[PDB]
Amino acid sequence: SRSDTLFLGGEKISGDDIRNQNVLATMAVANVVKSSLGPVGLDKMLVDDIGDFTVTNDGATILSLLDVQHPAGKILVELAQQQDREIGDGTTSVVIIASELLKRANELVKNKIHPTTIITGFRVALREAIRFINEVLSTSVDTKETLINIAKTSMSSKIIGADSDFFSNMVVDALLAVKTQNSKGEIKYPVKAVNVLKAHGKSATESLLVPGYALNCTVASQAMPKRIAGGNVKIACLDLNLQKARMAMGVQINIDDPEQLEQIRKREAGIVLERVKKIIDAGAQVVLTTKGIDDLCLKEFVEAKIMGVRRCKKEDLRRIARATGATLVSSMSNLEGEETFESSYLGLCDEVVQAKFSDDECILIKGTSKHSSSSIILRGANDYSLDEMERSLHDSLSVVKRTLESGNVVPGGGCVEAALNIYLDNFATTVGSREQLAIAEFAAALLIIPKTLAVNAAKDSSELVAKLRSYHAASQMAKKRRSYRNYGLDLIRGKIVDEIHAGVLEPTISKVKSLKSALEACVAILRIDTMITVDPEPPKEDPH
Amino acid sequence: GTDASQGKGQIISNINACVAVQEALKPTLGPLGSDILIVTSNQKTTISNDGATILKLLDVVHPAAKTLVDISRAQDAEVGDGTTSVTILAGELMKEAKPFLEEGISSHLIMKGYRKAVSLAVEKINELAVDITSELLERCARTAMSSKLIHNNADFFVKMCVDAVLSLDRNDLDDKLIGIKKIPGGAMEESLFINGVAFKKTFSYAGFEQQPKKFNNPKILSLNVELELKAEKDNAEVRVEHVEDYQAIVDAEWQLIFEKLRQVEETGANIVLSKLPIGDLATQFFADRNIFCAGRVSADDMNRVIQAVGGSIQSTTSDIKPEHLGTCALFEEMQIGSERYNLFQGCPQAKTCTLLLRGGAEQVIAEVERSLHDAIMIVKRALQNKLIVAGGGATEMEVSKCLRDYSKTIAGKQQMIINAFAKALEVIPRQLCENAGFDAIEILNKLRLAHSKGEKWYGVVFETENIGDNFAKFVWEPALVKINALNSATEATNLILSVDETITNKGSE
Amino acid sequence: LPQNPNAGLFKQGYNSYSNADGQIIKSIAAIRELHQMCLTSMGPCGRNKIIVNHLGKIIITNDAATMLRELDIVHPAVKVLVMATEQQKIDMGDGTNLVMILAGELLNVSEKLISMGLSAVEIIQGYNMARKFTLKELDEMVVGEITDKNDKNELLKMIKPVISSKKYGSEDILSELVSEAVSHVLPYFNVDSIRVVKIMGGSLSNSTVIKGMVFNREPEGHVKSLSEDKKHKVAVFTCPLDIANTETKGTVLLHNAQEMLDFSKGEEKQIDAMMKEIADMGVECIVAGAGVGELALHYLNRYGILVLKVPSKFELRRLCRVCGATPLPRLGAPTPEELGLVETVKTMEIGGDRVTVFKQEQGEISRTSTIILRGATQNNLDDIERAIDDGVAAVKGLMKPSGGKLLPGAGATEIELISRITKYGERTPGLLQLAIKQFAVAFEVVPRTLAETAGLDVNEVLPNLYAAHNVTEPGAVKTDHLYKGVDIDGESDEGVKDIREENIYDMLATKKFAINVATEAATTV
């Protein structure tokens, strides 16, 4: 035995046991969320071991709440949160593909295949797989009509699926209508998105979109107006923190002979108000700071009937000022010598009304100089849902962005993942020999998804998938069209149906970034045969 | 780390956990719903029928059960009357919708099947609509008063509430400007309703008792300042290099104190309310101006007096203006016996409305305001939305016989869903009868016949014998309530119906 | 600081009270727990669940009355519906699932009625008045020609469905052995005589049925036993073969040499004397049932006589009823009117085990027979004897007139009943209408339960059956091995009538007890 090194707490598994422990560890994190995907799929609830719950159908967020014990599992969790960065949706699915790739890969080396051969069998099947995407996604460049379809397909297999068509547009419209920027000669929609809130209580369907931002804040002093509308309003996003003023540190104050301690006491406050007025004198319809206004400096912004908001969200006053044409001012001084302020700093909106939403109230900002402001204020039964409703939002808004930032889209619904299944094996198997058996499993591993889309329905679905096969295989082989292929799964009603004929549609990007990373993960684990795991640092527990 | 229950084997534990919470609210319904004495921690001990407080001070372990107890307050804020009912509906809504889960194809066919429900039902809930004059609101405000221990004096409160609502006085009335003192003792009919602000503020002017007990035509100044020797905000230190610059500094202290009130009396003030206490020196220099001064007033309070009086709160007296002083009729600090209290009322067109109550122990009083709020609020619900619904569970039975009609008129395998939603709404009046039975069941079919060809209204009385007719009876629940109560009841179940697995640990990683 | 609610009325140690309505909601679910576990068990195309004894033994069955037999429950309410199935398996072989299935469902559907507004007393009378109508209606819903019992013709037709229910797929071959072992009992008949003996080795399809019981034992007398004969006449008796031992106090005393020198001989004398006496009678085989003496065993081996070791007191009987002889205490004094002829008493070995047999009869033909079940799994071979005992109980009912009345099983009847029971409540004034329309839909179990087993979309199977009231027999059912809904008449599939009646009664009886109780005062430890 051994001696080897080093125990205790430091151990290592070898060859078979690892290649297995790795696969088990992957099917683990995988098989949990293998129910989620597909319209037929459901949501789950995770317990904060302190009672607190959290209902969610998202695969990414769901795996995070799992805790990811072990290297192989956490590796998938890491691959998950990658997908949101690429896309935003499909996290639930990407994990599956990967897991299935290992599952099968190992089931090959368990057949004494050897990993090197396999790791290439994917390396190739992957490239050719994208080469087939070149035939599928391209036809999906031309087909606002098909944008509401993509935003809708991002609703199914989700809570907001029941109100899909309704929120399908609330999603599209804010980004399409009011959310466009431009940096260094590039046009793109907010990959950081547009403020979205949640309204406790109220109706499901009645989630109010807004023709402006929805800064979540309350009026500084009650004495201020609760609304200032009409047209051409004076907005001011001032991060000056115009509250008070204390001596500059390191600049101590020792007085004498006076009898002048008072001659500057007020002078400390004066310089504050002097700057406050200098700004109020340029517009001051509404003032929005980040640091906050002071009681002794609110009375001044109050008497003038100027709405003032104490300490706002810095990430907001930016997006707000960018739409109203204003300029989020940092320091008062502008060149030297300057106080200063210029009416050229203020913004341009229509209404600044502080609305109400069930025991709560937030200030809205409707209309802007540049018409780019959108804020969707959800509203449902409990926080437990109103939050998850947002998850379907953050995960659907994305699917659109990625789409509108890449002309190419793809017929989802198990369609693509079905064509590849037939296409590579029937047509990839030119090399043959052993490498063939590898490519094969790489294609077979793809069916994993279409399968679960069906198994999600209690009813025997072994056949519904069998049909999706013969159909898709029909595009070429075997033994001027009209092309009889391109169909897909209609989970809602059993039997195949053309997906393009339906609202269903997933961005090509998503079908790539996920197909690609699912491989690297798989590979990286294939190369594994020994996991040395050394114990951490124990407590001193010194007998002396 | 831990296990997890999934599938139907768990889907159930979600439902029966839902029904579980509602089971503890059946007694509470308007008619003879008996008060529940709930002992809580720390040493809190409440008693009433107000759902969003009988459940609030009642903790629950399960997830589903924790979603229900949430809809309670999820509803109370929105309208603020459908406390007891929303839970009772949300729950029963799943019980009669469960056997359609397994026997039904999926949990998602039921989802879509519920939309066509809430949509249609909200419609039927709009058919039975009434118009509010905006005196006559006293007719509806009676109903909120009726369940709780306000019935004994149903009249006295309805007025005390629509009056408080009346004062403010904005398109939207914020009950944040409607303080509610609750003095112990006297008689429940002794619960006046001042048109100003009541303060536990004892004999103002802590220097001496010289300041006027009350003043006719007071010209108030409400300040957030400190009114005491200000200290250098910028960390300053003194250096007495001189020999008698010590006495001169000591003077500079009492000086600024005088210069302080000096420019505050210039507004011809005869009474000042400072959020912060005042130094004895500045307590005297102004005292010779026969002006009253009360300090330690709460931040929120000095906002009620901000609308009552009319003067605007201002900081740094130097820049004081004539538009800062106010006009209120009097300030009399009558003793509540053993404990003082400064009252301040009057002023035309004033929003603030502090309605002091009376009766029994501090706890008795509590449950009074507790239900009083249910009143005050129930009138705003009807005021912001001027239209009402046929109460008495009639509205409920209506959407039940209406949906039920839609049942057969549906060609699909998801028919068994709309049906469920219907059957569950009949249960809304069910307890109304079961709380005054025996027996609830016989009266059920009675309303079904009446609704069919007995016109929309006509529900169950809470007297109660049984069947009646609400428009005649005089129990009309503001549509706004019933609207959202049903909506809150259906959607939460839908989210919960969407669940098929429960994990028992968190990273949060 | 406080607080704490005192205790309203005290008692001893700890006791558990249960408000009746709350208990009904609560205990109706406990019941419901074992329901979803018994649903998947009933019917052929179903499933079997393993159970590990409190002693560690492993058990697998399809039978629901056994699932509970091996199950240690706690719920006093569930205890009832368990006592039901168990209190039936003994009286009537099959039908143990229709017990739980109905019972559970009856409770399940009664809930709706209890919640609507009804009362337990109202609910009871409701269901009850249905049990009297459902029992009678069925007494005529038969239409299944009460076939007369002869040979294997009618037997195999009935004994199959009783078997194809759990051990599906071996229906044919299985029941074959059953009916086989049956027709070896010349027709009042005793069910108990057909014993079963399973021995490991080969596949189940290699099992056989011999006219006579099998002994997993070797012939005594060592290498002096024949272990192979031809048409030998046997003689079985209990009393110990050895010397006549003193039942009471008794020893052996000797005074003089002549005594000792002869006492040793005296034994030898009596020994041979007793033996040869019984041997001359033509006795070709002595089946010892109690005690064997080596002292006198010296004799029996030499002439050429077999000797079957002493079985169990209860096994001697079923044996004797094969040979034709009769047991007789005390040694010697054999009576030819008490002797019996046995065809063959050879020593064959299956699975490599020394075994003696009574297989085949020229011959007198045994009155009791045993089935030899070869298999590969201790567990399966056990849940095969069960599917057999079920059959042996089905032939026990057909043997007692006039229970030999067939009936459209396979859900057929359990579906027609749906409507037939509806009409009764459809035309009976009062509040009891509801309590009846419920008892009706309660029978939705058997229908759906069959469909859900095969993956059949239950939402189609039910509607189809409703359309198919055909009344041809029916004439209407569901076979998991086809498309849409199958036809009972065709498959020759019909469940014996009386079994269904017993099931439909014991359930409506048990379900009523559970409904009847209002408060449950359970103790502790």
Ligand SMILES: Nc1ncnc2c1ncn2[C@@H]1O[C@@H](COP(=O)(O)OP(=O)(O)O)[C@@H](O)[C@H]1O
């Ligand atoms: N074609 C069929 N032949 C025999 N039985 C069938 C057939 N189709 C369905 N079955 C079901 O198999 C039997 C019931 O299963 P079983 O486990 O034996 O319940 P139980 O033993 O309590 O009667 C039938 O009475 C019937 O409901």
Ligand SMILES: Nc1ncnc2c1ncn2[C@@H]1O[C@@H](COP(=O)(O)OP(=O)(O)O)[C@H](O)[C@H]1O
């Ligand atoms: N209506 C549909 N029918 C069949 N497959 C669909 C349908 N809609 C989407 N899919 C495919 O299966 C989905 C699985 O759900 P997924 O997006 O992974 O989780 P979520 O939608 O909750 O973010 C894919 O997004 C998609 O390619």
Ligand SMILES: Nc1ncnc2c1ncn2[C@@H]1O[C@H](COP(=O)(O)OP(=O)(O)O)[C@H](O)[C@H]1O
């Ligand atoms: N006497 C009554 N009979 C029937 N319904 C009533 C009666 N009184 C009030 N209601 C309506 O039923 C509602 C639901 O109950 P809720 O006010 O939420 O809690 P609670 O009824 O216990 O005060 C309201 O009380 C009311 O609009």
Ligand code: BEF
């Ligand atoms: F796939 Be989704 F984003 F959960």
Ligand code: BEF
């Ligand atoms: F609970 Be009720 F509304 F007073």
Ligand code: BEF
């Ligand atoms: F279920 Be039966 F009794 F085999």
